[PDB]
Structures are given as C-alpha cells and as structure tokens.
Amino acid sequence: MLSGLNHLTLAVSQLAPSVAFYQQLLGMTLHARWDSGAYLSCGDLWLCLSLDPQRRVTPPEESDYTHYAFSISEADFASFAARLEAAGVAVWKLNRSEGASHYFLDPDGHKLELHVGSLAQRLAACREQPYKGMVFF
Amino acid sequence: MLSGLNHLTLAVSQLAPSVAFYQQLLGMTLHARWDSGAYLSCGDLWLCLSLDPQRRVTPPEESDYTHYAFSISEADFASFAARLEAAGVAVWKLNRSEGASHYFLDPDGHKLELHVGSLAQRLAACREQPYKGMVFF
Ligand SMILES: CSc1nccnn1
Numbered sequence: 001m002l003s004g005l006n007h008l009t010l011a012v013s014q015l016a017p018s019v020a021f022y023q024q025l026l027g028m029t030l031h032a033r034w035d036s037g038a039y040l041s042c043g044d045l046w047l048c049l050s051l052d053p054q055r056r057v058t059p060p061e062e063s064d065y066t067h068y069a070f071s072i073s074e075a076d077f078a079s080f081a082a083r084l085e086a087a088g089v090a091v092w093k094l095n096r097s098e099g100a101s102h103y104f105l106d107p108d109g110h111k112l113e114l115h116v117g118s119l120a121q122r123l124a125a126c127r128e129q130p131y132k133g134m135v136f137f
Numbered sequence: 138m139l140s141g142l143n144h145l146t147l148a149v150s151q152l153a154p155s156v157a158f159y160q161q162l163l164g165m166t167l168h169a170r171w172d173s174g175a176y177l178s179c180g181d182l183w184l185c186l187s188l189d190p191q192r193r194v195t196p197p198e199e200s201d202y203t204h205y206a207f208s209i210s211e212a213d214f215a216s217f218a219a220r221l222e223a224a225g226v227a228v229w230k231l232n233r234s235e236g237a238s239h240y241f242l243d244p245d246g247h248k249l250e251l252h253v254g255s256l257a258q259r260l261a262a263c264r265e266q267p268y269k270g271m272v273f274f
Pocket residue numbers: 007009037048050
C-alpha cells in the first residue's frame with residue numbers, strides 16, 4: 001500500500017532565490033543542485049525544487065488553501081516565526097484555526113506553515129474544541 | 138529548527154469525492170471529518186483535505202510541476218498503478234527517471250505520484266550520472 005510522502009516537489013520561477021530561502025532562511029539541508037533544480041532535506045522530508053518556466057509568483061488571495069506545514073518544537077516556534085517576520089517574509093494567514101501555527105509565503109507564493117504538534121495532538125485538541133460537524137473515527 | 142513535514146493540506150472543491158479518492162481508492166486512513174474538511178494519515182504523512190470554494194478543477198496543462206509523491210514498494214507498484222488505471226484516474230506524465238514512478242491526478246487536478254526509491258538512492262544515481270550543472274554538498 002502507500003506508506004507516506006516520498007517527496008514534495010515545488011515548482012520555482014528562480015532557482016537560486018528559492019534554494020537560498022529553503023536552505024539559508026529555513027535551515028534545510030542542501031544535498032545537490034543543478035541547472036534546473038535542487039534536492040534538500042528537512043528531517044526525513046525529501047524536498048525537490050524544480051525550475052519551471054510555468055511557475056508564477058502568486059499572491060495568496062489568488063491561490064487556494066493548499067499548503068505545506070513544517071514541524072517545529074514548542075521551544076523554537078516563537079523565535080523562528082519572529083525571525084521570519086523580522087526578515088520581511090510575507091504572510092498569508094493570521095487566525096490560528098488549527099493550533100500553534102505561523103503562516104508564511106515562499107518567494108513564489110507557495111503557502112507554508114510552521115506548526116507545533118502531531119496529528120494525534122490535533123485530534124485530542126479537536127475533541128475539546130471541534131470543528132463544526134466533526135466526527136472522529 | 139525544522140524537523141520534517143508536519144502536514145500536507147490539499148484544497149478540494151467537493152469533500153465527498155476527495156475523501157473517497159484518498160481513503161477508498163488510495164487506501165489512506167480517515168481519522169476525522171467535519172463539514173469543511175478531513176484528516177487522513179498515510180504512514181507518517183498527516184494529510185488534510187480542506188473544502189475550499191476557491192479550488193478550481195485544474196487541467197494538468199494549466200498547473201505547474203508542483204506535485205506530491207507517495208511511497209510504495211517495488212513489489213506493490215504495478216498492481217497499484219493498475220488499480221488507478223481501472224478506476225480511470227488520469228496520468229499527467231510518463232516516467233523517464235530512476236525508480237518506478239506513476240504520475241496521476243486527483244479529482245481537482247492535484248498532481249500526484251507513486252514513487253519507489255529514496256533521496257539517498259536518487260543521489261547515488263546522480264553521482265554516477267550527474268544532471269547538467271550538478272554540484273553536490
Ligand atoms: C530531476 S527533477 C525531479 N527530481 C526529483 C523529484 N522530482 N523531480
């Protein structure tokens with residue numbers, strides 16, 4: 001059967017600024033780059049940045065809610081979010097509707113998130129403060 | 138410091154067919170559902186389906202190369218691809234890289250992939266046959 005996420009591939013319009021964002025600003029590990037892409041890891045996540053002439057820099061009001069959240073500890077969350085803020089990283093959401101999260105945009109407008117907590121913890125929180133109509137299996 | 142992918146959230150135009158696709162066709166575990174979304178797991182992956190009226194059913198020619206690859210064993214790959222084909226799931230790309238890959242679309246046109254092989258495997262293959270301009274770190 002399917003066993004998890006093998007890799008996340010993001011189309012990027014300019015490779016070097018995107019590599020710098022994920023490696024320098026977000027602290028991900030850069031393993032290789034070539035004329036048309038790069039391979040990074042974030043813990044167990046395999047991230048591929050793929051230079052795509054079709055990728056547009058997309059304002060957050062023009063894209064849907066599809067987004068990618070990265071795990072961070074409770075101890076590191078606030079200072080990492082504040083550092084992104086001080087660095088001028090654009091945002092896309094302010095209301096914490098799914099726990100402790102910071103919502104920010106990559107250079108092409110990919111919707112990203114820092115989040116503290118697992119699925120199990122989110123389900124436990126939702127049992128006390130459920131979303132409308134919520135059923136647990 | 139970021140420790141991995143926390144969750145992947147896909148905006149969906151209709152919740153019921155998306156739940157059917159990820160739970161029933163793809164075999165993911167459904168943990169909770171509410172009026173405007175669902176939480177599923179696939180191995181370590183926490184997947185959120187978020188009902189979003191802004192989600193367009195998007196032809197693959199009209200979206201960039203951003204995509205989400207799920208892990209499957211070599212032994213299971215061909216029968217899973219055949220299951221998707223029997224269900225009439227559209228393919229958006231043929232495989233031309235190392236490791237088995239099947240490139241398929243979800244009901245809203247999200248670009249998905251079944252892939253066999255890790256980042257370490259890909260890096261080893263690239264070391265032997267580097268892409269144009271490839272540098273390792
Ligand atoms: C070589 S381009 C690519 N590489 C890995 C994953 N997705 N795309």
